[PDB]
Design a protein around this ligand. Structure first.
Ligand SMILES: Cc1cc2nc3c(=O)[nH]c(=O)nc-3n(C[C@H](O)[C@H](O)[C@H](O)COP(=O)(O)OP(=O)(O)OC[C@H]3O[C@@H](n4cnc5c(N)ncnc54)[C@H](O)[C@@H]3O)c2cc1C
Ligand SMILES: Cc1cc2nc3c(=O)[nH]c(=O)nc-3n(C[C@H](O)[C@H](O)[C@H](O)COP(=O)(O)OP(=O)(O)OC[C@H]3O[C@@H](n4cnc5c(N)ncnc54)[C@H](O)[C@@H]3O)c2cc1C
Ligand SMILES: NC(=O)c1ccc[n+]([C@@H]2O[C@H](COP(=O)([O-])OP(=O)(O)OC[C@H]3O[C@@H](n4cnc5c(N)ncnc54)[C@H](OP(=O)(O)O)[C@@H]3O)[C@@H](O)[C@H]2O)c1
Ligand SMILES: NC(=O)c1ccc[n+]([C@@H]2O[C@H](COP(=O)([O-])OP(=O)(O)OC[C@H]3O[C@@H](n4cnc5c(N)ncnc54)[C@H](OP(=O)(O)O)[C@@H]3O)[C@@H](O)[C@H]2O)c1
Lengths: 446, 446
């Protein structure tokens, strides 16, 4: 065992990828540092865990989860698929390209349970505060064991933060919103459309959440859905029951007034206005201070905190790629920590960061975004022993998905794609997505 | 100024009472310590501020507020009157015994505005973490300035914690609640009865929140309200529209099943199941680890943390008495910090704590609880120059209030009581409470 201590905050996909990188090293027969992972929730898997709770959890901490009932795969499952654990391996039968959450999580956990992750994680424990000690070159981290109601401290030579960035709402005030008599919530609190059956719903925002929650409400029987955008409409061809409007200027009781001078009464308002990066446990000189984008500033190779290189952030980028991207990040972080990758000087890092920050700014369209992230991963992968996979093919599948959503927003989850791991083409699902109101694993594999 | 630094966490009634106690000392011409108060919200007033937000606030910290639209004082104002600032001098017109939230906020604010206290409070700032430094005999406190997204630290000789204990929900799981298709929330996130017009509502619990939210819903137009109790029903004489059932055993879709074998469909479930003490910013050896009751253990005179006497807790007891109890506590804290009251040794404190804990355990009926807290305050108020008032008379008024509520739960707020500070009898309000749907300060005073 190396004379090095590494602390990992979070046992979601990012933290688990850090554990994967180290497990791979130890499977070579190579020594690794002492590793400890700490997770706020009672289970691993992060965002993938569904909870009925909203606001704060049973112990009073902000609720991490943002997933809802009736959630299905964002993009094709073939863009998620792991090299080392394929969908064919797990399910032993072809399935469609868009499984529901329970099915994806069954696959995700199938791999985690084969790993040694359980050996390294302490659950129900939150990182509460962090001091960096200049003279020790270590982080002193305060943890709160929520189950024991005890606090404790640990010291680490490297600290890896994988706490996500889709959990603390950006929940802006709108004029008069406090006069609104119905439900007012952020997408973070949305748990399913059943409570909104036969109601008129206003969604504010125009991104993934607005689109998916809006369609769900329509599909599951809301009286009507309005999506209100700030800058750009979704532009999808909507059915009767969903419509788009420009931005809300203000509310007067249950009436929303819009920029085009129209107004409508609503039963509920759901703000689909995105999330903030929030690190309450970090002093501000260690915080990522960024808007959500594909390449936050102050992160060398998108991973090493530029102003204190012993602090590592994983998964803090906006995401097309998820698990496989986190893997490439973790492998790089590992090799850096093990001394296998030499960190260049500050001037060189600054230059590289500026280059990628500028490349990101220059990307505008969805296809350009996909290509940017693909290029980002391509670079990381070439720096380590991480097994290559067909990034070009996956990028083309993301681009095809984006075009499918533009072509038909209600039915794109009916399309099938081909695995880049196994070459197997997904099989048409037994029920068209619009007709499937049962998201259970049992129903899906039935 | 004394060479002593006192930090106060919270600018609700308790923190403001601490400020007032020190203000009152300085008015004698005596030196006081350097004092700094820190408050999470944008203004003072604590629980008495209304926010339309739920779950977490705009900066992602758990929401403090539990008050809702249409909330009125639930005990006679004569029971909470400050001993050094009367309703007579504040409003200068006669008012009733049960004012709405805005009116009591005005009163709370009235007293603090007599001083320059506002310049001693830093708003939008959360206490994040505390280290007690044994060798320095000081608390190192980390604060998070939410607006600037900056952290900073301060050192204090004494730390006064006035952060409340009615903000972190006790949110128990009930079998099948995760499959209930309607609105589910804790009372903490209830913001008013308008959202439940024409709906069937289930309230779980049988104390103040259940009782008041039940009557609110009924008054504002709910179809029906069910209050489900764990041990004892409220036992009030309910109008048609409100009923009581024993405890919910499980949910099956929108159907709640009760202990008595009955069942009923509901549109919404509100858990009125109380709150937890929660101090995420304190190490566990500085936490009160207590269930809610009238005398939490480990607090000498209900105020001084027994295992570290430089830590002071205000208002951590369950409450019949409120404002003038916090004052009594704050004055005692002040005199201790100034050295006007000498702390007895640990053995003596242990004995006194045990005596009071046992007396509390013995108290069972509402009247016994009232007498217990009366006795607690009677002892403490004699120890300082906070002006002693007729506690026995307030106890009688509380017992009358319990009687009024038993007699007619719908009109108890129309009853009038006499001040023990000034002997002024409250005047019947211009509108009966059941007929008053306008809770504005303006409507109330005019
Ligand atoms: C609504 C939604 C739907 C999505 N759907 C898909 C999809 O279909 N397919 C897909 O590929 N991707 C999807 N994603 C994105 C992607 O899968 C997730 O963002 C992914 O889980 C990122 O993993 P992570 O570990 O970086 O963050 P998270 O999964 O959020 O994990 C962070 C972990 O850190 C823990 N944590 C946080 N703070 C602390 C603390 N102070 N102390 C200790 N632990 C802490 C949390 O409990 C959590 O377990 C979706 C995202 C969202 C929001
Ligand atoms: C719904 C409800 C209705 C009530 N109605 C009545 C009533 O009608 N009559 C009555 O007499 N009493 C009522 N009470 C209780 C009573 O008013 C309390 O005695 C009083 O509000 C408590 O004052 P406090 O300052 O001790 O706590 P609070 O008023 O809760 O104030 C705590 C303050 O500390 C701040 N804070 C918390 N954590 C931090 C942190 N980490 N850093 C910085 N600041 C922090 C909070 O923002 C808040 O301002 C009610 C309570 C509730 C919840
Ligand atoms: N499995 C699924 O199908 C599923 C569904 C839900 C979410 N997800 C995931 O959840 C993550 C987050 O996506 P997200 O949509 O929640 O947030 P987001 O992608 O970050 O998008 C933010 C949206 O909110 C709008 N907005 C921000 N501030 C606003 C304001 N002050 N007023 C009005 N509008 C404002 C933005 O408008 P502008 O154009 O002006 O910026 C933008 O439309 C993604 O990773 C996504 O993958 C997946
Ligand atoms: N001004 C107003 O109108 C107003 C309105 C709301 C609240 N308040 C204040 O807010 C404070 C808190 O009052 P509160 O009523 O919310 O809390 P509370 O007084 O602590 O009451 C808690 C209730 O929850 C019940 N309970 C706890 N756990 C339960 C479980 N697992 N299952 C079922 N029931 C459970 C308790 O039943 P048991 O008896 O069995 O323990 C109890 O009835 C009080 O100071 C109150 O005055 C004032």
């Amino acid at each position: 065992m190396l004379n090095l201590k590494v602390g990992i905050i979070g046992a979601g996909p990012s933290g688990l990828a850090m554990l994967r990188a180290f497990e791979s090293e130890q499977k070579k027969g190579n020594p690794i540092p002492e590793i400890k992972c700490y997770e706020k929730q009672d289970n691993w898997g992060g965002m993938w865990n569904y909870t009925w709770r909203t606001g704060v959890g049973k112990y009073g901490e902000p609720i991490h989860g943002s997933m809802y009932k009736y959630l299905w795969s964002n993009g094709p499952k073939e863009c998620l698929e792991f090299s080392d654990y394929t969908f064919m391996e797990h399910f032993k039968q072809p399935i469609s390209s868009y499984p529901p959450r329970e099915v994806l999580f069954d696959y995700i956990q199938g791999r985690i349970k084969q790993s040694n992750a359980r050996d390294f994680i302490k659950f129900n424990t939150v990182a509460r505060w962090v001091d960096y000690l200049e003279d020790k070159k270590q982080f002193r981290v305060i943890f709160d064991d929520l189950v024991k109601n005890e606090t404790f401290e640990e010291y680490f030579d490297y600290l890896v933060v994988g706490t996500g960035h889709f959990s603390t709402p950006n929940m802006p005030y709108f004029k008069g919103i406090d006069s609104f008599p119905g439900t007012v919530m952020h997408a973070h609190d949305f748990r399913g459309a059943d409570q909104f059956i036969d109601k008129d719903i206003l969604l504010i925002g125009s991104s993934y959440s607005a689109e998916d929650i809006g369609v769900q409400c329509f599909k599951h029987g809301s009286k009507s859905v309005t999506i209100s955008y700030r800058t750009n409409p979704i532009g999808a061809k909507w059915p009767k029951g969903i419509e788009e409007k420009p931005i809300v200027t203000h509310f007067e009781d249950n009436v929303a007034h819009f920029k085009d001078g129209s107004k409508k009464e609503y039963d509920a308002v759901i703000l689909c206005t995105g999330y903030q990066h929030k690190f309450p446990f970090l002093p501000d000189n260690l915080r990522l201070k960024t808007k959500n984008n594909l390449y936050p500033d102050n992160l060398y190779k998108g991973v090493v905190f530029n102003e204190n290189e012993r602090l590592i952030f994983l998964g803090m980028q906006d995401q097309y790629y998820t698990f496989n991207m986190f893997d490439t990040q973790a492998w790089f972080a590992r090799d850096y920590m093990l001394g296998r990758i030499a960190l260049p000087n500050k001037e060189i890092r600054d230059k590289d960061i500026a280059k990628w920050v500028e490349l990101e700014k220059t990307s505008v369209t969805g296809e350009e975004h996909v290509d940017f992230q693909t290029d980002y991963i391509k670079e990381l992968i070439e720096m380590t022993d991480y097994p290559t996979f067909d990034l070009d093919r996956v990028a083309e599948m993301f681009k095809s998905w984006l075009n499918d959503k533009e072509t038909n927003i209600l039915n794109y989850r009916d399309k099938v794609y081909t695995s880049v791991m196994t070459g197997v083409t997904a099989e048409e699902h037994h029920t068209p997505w619009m007709k499937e109101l049962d998201d259970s694993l049992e129903r899906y594999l039935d």
